[PDB]
Amino acid sequence: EIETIVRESEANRIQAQTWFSHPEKSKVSFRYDERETSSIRSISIETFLSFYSSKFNREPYSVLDIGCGQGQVIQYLNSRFQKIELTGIDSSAQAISSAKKLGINASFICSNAENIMQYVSKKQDIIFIHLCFGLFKNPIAIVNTLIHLLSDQSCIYIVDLDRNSLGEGLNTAQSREEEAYLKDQYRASLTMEEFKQLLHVVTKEQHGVSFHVGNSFIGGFDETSSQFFSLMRNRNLQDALRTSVGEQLKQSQMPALLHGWIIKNK
Numbered sequence: 001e002i003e004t005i006v007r008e009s010e011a012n013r014i015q016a017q018t019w020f021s022h023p024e025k026s027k028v029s030f031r032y033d034e035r036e037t038s039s040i041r042s043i044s045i046e047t048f049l050s051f052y053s054s055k056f057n058r059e060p061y062s063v064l065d066i067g068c069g070q071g072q073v074i075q076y077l078n079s080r081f082q083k084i085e086l087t088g089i090d091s092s093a094q095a096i097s098s099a100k101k102l103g104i105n106a107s108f109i110c111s112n113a114e115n116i117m118q119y120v121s122k123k124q125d126i127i128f129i130h131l132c133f134g135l136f137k138n139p140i141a142i143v144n145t146l147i148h149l150l151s152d153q154s155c156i157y158i159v160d161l162d163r164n165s166l167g168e169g170l171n172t173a174q175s176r177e178e179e180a181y182l183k184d185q186y187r188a189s190l191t192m193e194e195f196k197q198l199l200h201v202v203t204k205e206q207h208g209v210s211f212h213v214g215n216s217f218i219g220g221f222d223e224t225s226s227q228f229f230s231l232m233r234n235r236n237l238q239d240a241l242r243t244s245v246g247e248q249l250k251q252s253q254m255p256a257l258l259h260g261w262i263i264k265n266k
């Protein structure tokens with residue numbers, strides 16, 4: 001039962017979040033994230049851009065980046081499009097300070113993402129939740145809120161750790177502190193089993209809203225999917241994929257990620 005599952009794992013998520021709110025821990029988390037999670041960024045972004053284009057045959061007018069960190073995703077998107085409404089939200093004041101220093105045409109908000117409605121009213125074409133879902137105290141509540149911010153043609157794209165991938169995660173750790181960090185992060189994560197239930201519950205009563213979940217490398221779409229084929233026709237995604245090859249080991253040696261889509265098409 002997903003509501004119960006989420007409630008009972010709340011303490012784990014609180015503990016994982018200390019790695020972003022406590023001064024000493026935050027140094028460990030930033031260093032690890034920069035070194036080991038930067039490579040996927042381009043892939044994840046080009047995946048949602050290709051999805052959007054394949055689904056609605058236009059570029060998104062707006063992107064909202066949840067847990068935007070130091071603004072790296074927004075920076076990438078800003079260099080990509082001539083005109084796009086970019087908004088990033090993160091509860092770390094240091095992170096938002098860093099994002100604002102980039103001097104980019106974007107709105108950066110420092111707040112719990114739970115509070116998004118206090119700052120944003122315009123419906124968003126894409127809401128991106130990259131590598132932060134398991135940090136939310138109330139992840140169902142935040143998703144319900146974000147669904148209300150979706151435009152008539154839109155998606156939430158969530159990429160996050162799968163709890164059972166801890167072992168492969170630990171193989172990328174380069175210190176005892178990093179080991180402790182990942183142990184806490186993976187403990188707070190969902191499994192595919194849980195994540196599917198979560199996506200089902202938040203979408204089932206919502207007219208014109210559907211979901212997709214998967215752990216395959218490319219948006220969680222497996223190689224049999226017609227949506228997958230459409231995604232892969234996109235040159236920008238193809239180029240990001242080709243470029244990435246030299247940074248990675250065999251698939252079985254890398255941590256599997258959860259990929260979830262909440263898709264609105266009214």
Ligand SMILES: CCOC(=O)c1csc(-c2nc(-c3csc([C@@H](N)CCCNC(=N)N)n3)oc2C)n1
Pocket residue numbers: 016033036037039040130131132133134135160161169172182184185186188189190248254255257
């Ligand atoms: C290119 C192939 O990619 C890989 O081979 C690869 C190796 S390690 C890795 C990865 N490790 C994280 C991660 C750990 S801690 C964190 C923080 N952002 C906090 C996570 C918060 N979420 C949860 N705890 N659930 N990210 O993200 C990614 C994509 N990917």
Ligand SMILES: Nc1ncnc2c1ncn2[C@@H]1O[C@H](CSCC[C@H](N)C(=O)O)[C@@H](O)[C@H]1O
Pocket residue numbers: 017020033037066067068069070073089090091092095111112113114129130131132135136137
């Ligand atoms: N409730 C919340 N609201 C907004 N941001 C949050 C949050 N809990 C954690 N975060 C932020 O989530 C981020 C996780 S690490 C950075 C994730 C980033 N999206 C990336 O692509 O790598 C941290 O910057 C942390 O400050």
